Amino acid sequence: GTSQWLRKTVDSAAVILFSKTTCPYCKKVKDVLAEAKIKHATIELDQLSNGSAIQKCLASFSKIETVPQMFVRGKFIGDSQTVLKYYSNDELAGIVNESKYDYDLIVIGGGSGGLAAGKEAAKYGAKTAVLDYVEPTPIGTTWGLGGTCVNVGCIPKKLMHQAGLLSHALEDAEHFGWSLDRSKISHNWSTMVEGVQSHIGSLNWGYKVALRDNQVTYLNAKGRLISPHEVQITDKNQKVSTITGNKIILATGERPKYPEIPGAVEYGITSDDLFSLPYFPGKTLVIGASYVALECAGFLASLGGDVTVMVRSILLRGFDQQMAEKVGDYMENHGVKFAKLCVPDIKQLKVVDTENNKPGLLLVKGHYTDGKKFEEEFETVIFAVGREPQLSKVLCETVGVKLDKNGRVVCTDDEQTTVSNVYAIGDINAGKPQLTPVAIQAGRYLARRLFAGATELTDYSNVATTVFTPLEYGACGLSEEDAIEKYGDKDIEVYHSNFKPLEWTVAHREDNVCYMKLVCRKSDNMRVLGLHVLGPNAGEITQGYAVAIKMGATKADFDRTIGIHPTCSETFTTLHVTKKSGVSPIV
Amino acid sequence: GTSQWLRKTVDSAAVILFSKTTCPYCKKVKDVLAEAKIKHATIELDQLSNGSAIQKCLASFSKIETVPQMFVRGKFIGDSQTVLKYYSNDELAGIVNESKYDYDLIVIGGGSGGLAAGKEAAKYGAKTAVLDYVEPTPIGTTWGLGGTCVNVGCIPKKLMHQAGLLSHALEDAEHFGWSLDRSKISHNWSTMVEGVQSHIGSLNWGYKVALRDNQVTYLNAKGRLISPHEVQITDKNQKVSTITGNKIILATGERPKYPEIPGAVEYGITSDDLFSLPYFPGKTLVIGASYVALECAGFLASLGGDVTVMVRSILLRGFDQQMAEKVGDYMENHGVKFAKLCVPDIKQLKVVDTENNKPGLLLVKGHYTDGKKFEEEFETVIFAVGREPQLSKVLCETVGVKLDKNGRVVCTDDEQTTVSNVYAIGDINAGKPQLTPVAIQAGRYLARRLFAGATELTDYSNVATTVFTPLEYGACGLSEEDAIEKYGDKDIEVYHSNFKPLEWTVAHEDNVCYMKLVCRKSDNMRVLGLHVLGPNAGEITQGYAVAIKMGATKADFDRTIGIHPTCSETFTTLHVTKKSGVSPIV
Numbered sequence A: 001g002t003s004q005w006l007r008k009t010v011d012s013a014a015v016i017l018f019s020k021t022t023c024p025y026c027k028k029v030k031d032v033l034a035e036a037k038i039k040h041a042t043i044e045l046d047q048l049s050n051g052s053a054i055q056k057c058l059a060s061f062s063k064i065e066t067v068p069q070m071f072v073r074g075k076f077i078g079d080s081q082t083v084l085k086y087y088s089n090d091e092l093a094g095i096v097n098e099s100k101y102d103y104d105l106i107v108i109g110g111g112s113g114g115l116a117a118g119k120e121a122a123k124y125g126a127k128t129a130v131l132d133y134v135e136p137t138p139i140g141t142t143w144g145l146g147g148t149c150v151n152v153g154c155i156p157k158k159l160m161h162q163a164g165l166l167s168h169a170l171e172d173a174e175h176f177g178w179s180l181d182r183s184k185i186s187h188n189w190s191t192m193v194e195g196v197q198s199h200i201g202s203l204n205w206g207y208k209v210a211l212r213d214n215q216v217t218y219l220n221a222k223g224r225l226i227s228p229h230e231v232q233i234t235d236k237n238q239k240v241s242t243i244t245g246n247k248i249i250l251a252t253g254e255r256p257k258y259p260e261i262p263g264a265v266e267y268g269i270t271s272d273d274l275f276s277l278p279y280f281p282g283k284t285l286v287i288g289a290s291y292v293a294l295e296c297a298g299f300l301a302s303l304g305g306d307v308t309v310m311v312r313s314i315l316l317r318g319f320d321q322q323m324a325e326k327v328g329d330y331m332e333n334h335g336v337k338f339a340k341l342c343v344p345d346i347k348q349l350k351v352v353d354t355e356n357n358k359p360g361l362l363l364v365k366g367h368y369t370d371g372k373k374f375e376e377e378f379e380t381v382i383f384a385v386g387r388e389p390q391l392s393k394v395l396c397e398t399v400g401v402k403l404d405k406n407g408r409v410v411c412t413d414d415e416q417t418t419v420s421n422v423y424a425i426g427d428i429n430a431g432k433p434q435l436t437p438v439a440i441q442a443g444r445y446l447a448r449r450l451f452a453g454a455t456e457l458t459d460y461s462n463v464a465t466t467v468f469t470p471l472e473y474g475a476c477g478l479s480e481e482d483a484i485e486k487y488g489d490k491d492i493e494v495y496h497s498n499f500k501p502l503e504w505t506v507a508h509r510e511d512n513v514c515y516m517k518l519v520c521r522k523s524d525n526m527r528v529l530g531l532h533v534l535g536p537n538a539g540e541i542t543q544g545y546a547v548a549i550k551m552g553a554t555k556a557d558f559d560r561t562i563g564i565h566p567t568c569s570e571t572f573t574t575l576h577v578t579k580k581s582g583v584s585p586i587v
Numbered sequence B: 001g002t003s004q005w006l007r008k009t010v011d012s013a014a015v016i017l018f019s020k021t022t023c024p025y026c027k028k029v030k031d032v033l034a035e036a037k038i039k040h041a042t043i044e045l046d047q048l049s050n051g052s053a054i055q056k057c058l059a060s061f062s063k064i065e066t067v068p069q070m071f072v073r074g075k076f077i078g079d080s081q082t083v084l085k086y087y088s089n090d091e092l093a094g095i096v097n098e099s100k101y102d103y104d105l106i107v108i109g110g111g112s113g114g115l116a117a118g119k120e121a122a123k124y125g126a127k128t129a130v131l132d133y134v135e136p137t138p139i140g141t142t143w144g145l146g147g148t149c150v151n152v153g154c155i156p157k158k159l160m161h162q163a164g165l166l167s168h169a170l171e172d173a174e175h176f177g178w179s180l181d182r183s184k185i186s187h188n189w190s191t192m193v194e195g196v197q198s199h200i201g202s203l204n205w206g207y208k209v210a211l212r213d214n215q216v217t218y219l220n221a222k223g224r225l226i227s228p229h230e231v232q233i234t235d236k237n238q239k240v241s242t243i244t245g246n247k248i249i250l251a252t253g254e255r256p257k258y259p260e261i262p263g264a265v266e267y268g269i270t271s272d273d274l275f276s277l278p279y280f281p282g283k284t285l286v287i288g289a290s291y292v293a294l295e296c297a298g299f300l301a302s303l304g305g306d307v308t309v310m311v312r313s314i315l316l317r318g319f320d321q322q323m324a325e326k327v328g329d330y331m332e333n334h335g336v337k338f339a340k341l342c343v344p345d346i347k348q349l350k351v352v353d354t355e356n357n358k359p360g361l362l363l364v365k366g367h368y369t370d371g372k373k374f375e376e377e378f379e380t381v382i383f384a385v386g387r388e389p390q391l392s393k394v395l396c397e398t399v400g401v402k403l404d405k406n407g408r409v410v411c412t413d414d415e416q417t418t419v420s421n422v423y424a425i426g427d428i429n430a431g432k433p434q435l436t437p438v439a440i441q442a443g444r445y446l447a448r449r450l451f452a453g454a455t456e457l458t459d460y461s462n463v464a465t466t467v468f469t470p471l472e473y474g475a476c477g478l479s480e481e482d483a484i485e486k487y488g489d490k491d492i493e494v495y496h497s498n499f500k501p502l503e504w505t506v507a508h509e510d511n512v513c514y515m516k517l518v519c520r521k522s523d524n525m526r527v528l529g530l531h532v533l534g535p536n537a538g539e540i541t542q543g544y545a546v547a548i549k550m551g552a553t554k555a556d557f558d559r560t561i562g563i564h565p566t567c568s569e570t571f572t573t574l575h576v577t578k579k580s581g582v583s584p585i586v
């Protein structure tokens, strides 16, 4: 046990010192490594449960049982006397830099998970490279370092969502006594895009500075794994070459799908294009019903667009369907149109006026699930019908990395692939929630295990979400239907309530539109299986309850905790109406 | 064990049925009870672990061991056959209404705690009265049913806070691309107070409807406990009379303090007056440094006021002082002036212009702690120098209810006073956090124990708070300095970080928002306190209070994954310690 951990730690760490906090010979060695600017991992044995056992096992590698001991890339280098000898004779730099490979770690993909992994590895002395390349969209859109969330995902969509939220703040202000006239105020799309893009540019630059300042080599190049340790790179002049690395992390993400119909790729766009679009989309058709589809349709309408959503079957497939219908009903009442049970069969009527900064004009033909016909004109068509990786671009099938039926990488619970030195993290890891904080945790925890002897795994269970539709929807845990299916209706109790934000009272907003529920398991001390809230600031409300749910919260835990007044969130601490009772949840 | 519980439950329940869910004879009795409209508590012996023991113990009271058994005010009434007999013979209504007292429960005080207690008790068949009276302020201000929070507390102050927050939303709008010009927009105070007061009135009315619909007698009169069971009342015509009750709940709250200086009561106001003031206060001096003082100064400044706060010693005494100073620094950078280490020694220069709807004008003289002099003119002077009960207006000394040095009621952990049938809840319960949700929980749990045989006690530990200053401050648990005093600096580790809301990026400050976890090293890095300064701090904080109740450690925060993008997710990845000396900036 200790033996197998020690062997694993020594063989994969780049530079690691086994030390004790009390020993002055260790302090003397650390100061030498610091002066020569040699980064390394440190294991303080006088601070572990069985540091006394580890000390004995080190002898199997070094033939000595004492401390300090310094290792480089699996090889014992020396004790205090021996390392200072190398430093005195100017032999230390060559010892710590000699390696079978160009790099201790190559990360393919410069996004949420990839950049996190790369920065953390370099912290412990691993010589690291991060490759990033953004294949342009069909109309040519491209962007800088940071991945999907930073450039064409969470960051710009939540900023445009805020811009939509400000429209209702402006209406609310009259009722709170401010003198503005909401009716005489308009919105300027391109002014908003400029501010959003200027923030994104500051993040592109921040990441390049972080990589430099951590001694990480950044190559803006497309990488392709051709053998377990060989990566073929292609730079911006199409120059091809090969670099080698001990450990490999695949972190290349996904891109939007298009439906296989005429006109789609030629005349429509996706969220990849929307966030830097130089003109306001205008009358817009959104095809799809994922959280991407609904979030974009939501702020476009709040910024004054004529928005329609074409829905093939249901909204938010995979989420609690009662909550999904409440989300959609709110959007329909505040000016989003829906074309339900409908799929597209696109014709161009006007080309994009790239001079005067104006959209084109399109004709969309489709049909409903019973056979009736759809036909209508739109200035912009946005597709949001899912995302997929294309690992045939990234990874040669000869290498031996097993993929699933969807094209995602099959990993063990420590992100290891079927090839012992190759790992995968983020959206391409099969079966895991596809979220930015998840990929960041996976990458940081992997790097620590590879290069610092850490043991902690990433926990992928009960990860909380928030959908940033005009009225936001937070969740943690099981949907109601999933709990019933897993345990049976008789074993599931559901507490719920409508509520009204105190901020909505003076503004004359709706009484019984916000909603929340706890789905609980009767036979397990009324364990909270899932939490669900529809209302403002839903992600801030939900986050903290995810710690309690990780810890096994029951209904009695919610009951004995006191509320903060006045808040939306406090309604969770006094819930009492059950669905079984039949009593109304309104307030 | 069981037998002492049963005796206590039977003695004080007004009407209670011992029952089994399966039994059709019990269902038959249930069906008769309402129809006659008899509210009652029910205990299902087949749902309790020791139901077999309780069934046996009942025989000590009724000389029978079966179900159903129905009791009224401590006396066994009968089984199925006997209850139906009383029903057919028109005798049941008189049985259930027979009482030594006028009411099973008298609640003195119609506020957060008292309204909660009374409504809950009436659910289980207790005949209940709630008394509320609002002694006018020195200038005459009064208001309706619901207590301090509803009328002159949490509700109007958070609505005015929201009006203040909207000023900055109006500025932020231009950067997100909206065409308005913030510099040409003004605020109308009276329009805002009208909307606030209309909501408050709808709460006043809602409470009167709630008591009606629960069969609670609402008396708009002042109450005084003159003996353990005797409450003297004085109605709005000064008519005096006496009502009796079995159980008594004291729930009379506090009112604002004035300092003992010339001009204070005559020419200044308190928060009691602020939330319905007919004119904008204008240039305003706030004396005090409580959360009331800072919250009012803060929104008045956002609504265009020229505001100064006069601080005797420190801000937010009793809260974490690092967080307190960050709160104050932000206010000082965004308008509010502070007269630090200063106390007042008030002259009237203009009387309030009630006709033209304008404030008067005052001269304030005071001094700093080094002896230098303060002298300055203001239109409104708001005192926020604490709050206090006045139980020598509620409670005759001869009754025997013990008070502490501050004048609050000394209570057991089940809210019992030194007089066995008299209880106290809310702000006047000595040593308890003085917060509305606490009073509500205390009243509801007490009613269940008195009238439904419940056993659950209110848990007053680690109750979360939020101060709604212009940048909000949420907390749950120990301040950092309190943790260190109790355990020693070497056993305390603090993780912290600045952060920037994503909404602040396009609107253009980088390192003002802040959060920390104060942890105990020798107890698996247990989270002893959480603290956050930032927008929506109350929404951020609430959910972590459940995890802290459950004993959360730093490892529990670390293994939970963030929601992106949120301010709150910063709690899930904290790693910079204060001992490291590394900067918390971002």
Ligand SMILES: Cc1cc2nc3c(=O)[nH]c(=O)nc-3n(C[C@H](O)[C@H](O)[C@H](O)COP(=O)(O)OP(=O)(O)OC[C@H]3O[C@@H](n4cnc5c(N)ncnc54)[C@H](O)[C@@H]3O)c2cc1C
Residues within 6 Å of the ligand: A108, A109, A110, A111, A112, A113, A114, A131, A132, A133, A134, A135, A146, A147, A148, A149, A150, A152, A153, A154, A155, A157, A221, A222, A223, A224, A251, A252, A253, A254, A271, A292, A393, A394, A425, A426, A427, A428, A434, A435, A436, A437, A439, B563, B564, B565
């Ligand atoms: C519109 C939208 C909104 C979203 N909103 C949220 C939200 O609010 N919250 C949330 O948690 N998640 C959100 N997500 C999901 C989140 O963006 C992803 O889960 C996350 O970005 C995935 O990180 P990753 O490291 O796996 O890959 P990515 O972030 O996609 O980065 C992978 C990078 O590798 C590059 N790459 C690909 N192939 C190669 C190659 N051969 N060589 C070199 N580089 C290559 C890609 O171009 C990209 O830069 C959103 C996604 C979208 C599309």
Ligand SMILES: Cc1cc2nc3c(=O)[nH]c(=O)nc-3n(C[C@H](O)[C@H](O)[C@H](O)COP(=O)(O)OP(=O)(O)OC[C@H]3O[C@@H](n4cnc5c(N)ncnc54)[C@H](O)[C@@H]3O)c2cc1C
Residues within 6 Å of the ligand: A564, A565, A566, B108, B109, B110, B111, B112, B113, B114, B131, B132, B133, B134, B135, B146, B147, B148, B149, B150, B152, B153, B154, B155, B157, B221, B222, B223, B224, B251, B252, B253, B254, B271, B292, B393, B394, B425, B426, B427, B428, B434, B435, B436, B437, B439
């Ligand atoms: C400005 C301000 C802001 C606040 N903000 C918050 C906040 O955001 N969150 C929070 O949790 N708490 C807040 N509080 C505290 C909250 O108001 C109290 O904790 C809570 O209202 C106390 O409830 P209570 O039942 O003890 O008394 P109260 O709510 O004060 O009600 C007592 C009632 O009894 C009446 N009464 C008194 N004497 C008699 C008598 N002899 N006969 C009959 N009736 C009588 C009183 O007139 C009053 O109506 C705030 C307080 C103030 C002053």
Ligand SMILES: CC(C)c1ccc(C(=O)Nc2ccccn2)cc1
Residues within 6 Å of the ligand: A133, A134, A220, A221, A222, A234, A235, A236, A237, A238, A393
């Ligand atoms: C095989 C095919 C997918 C391919 C074609 C071209 C390139 C290319 O132009 N790369 C690059 C790198 C950085 C910035 C700009 N361009 C890479 C791969």
Ligand SMILES: CC(C)c1ccc(C(=O)Nc2ccccn2)cc1
Residues within 6 Å of the ligand: A281, A282, A283, A284, A304, A305, A306, A307, A335
């Ligand atoms: C059908 C209805 C919901 C609708 C909604 C919004 C508008 C609008 O004010 N703007 C608009 C329209 C077309 C292109 C761009 N913007 C018109 C109609």
Ligand SMILES: CC(C)c1ccc(C(=O)Nc2ccccn2)cc1
Residues within 6 Å of the ligand: B133, B134, B220, B221, B222, B234, B235, B236, B237, B238
């Ligand atoms: C307007 C209505 C609410 C009301 C008004 C006054 C009184 C009253 O007579 N109070 C009292 C208090 C102290 C000494 C004498 N009387 C009771 C209710």
Ligand SMILES: CC(C)c1ccc(C(=O)Nc2ccccn2)cc1
Residues within 6 Å of the ligand: B281, B282, B283, B284, B304, B305, B306, B307, B335
């Ligand atoms: C900081 C301080 C000098 C100040 C702040 C605000 C104002 C202001 O615009 N209004 C105002 C003035 C008097 C009474 C009420 N409001 C004037 C001076």
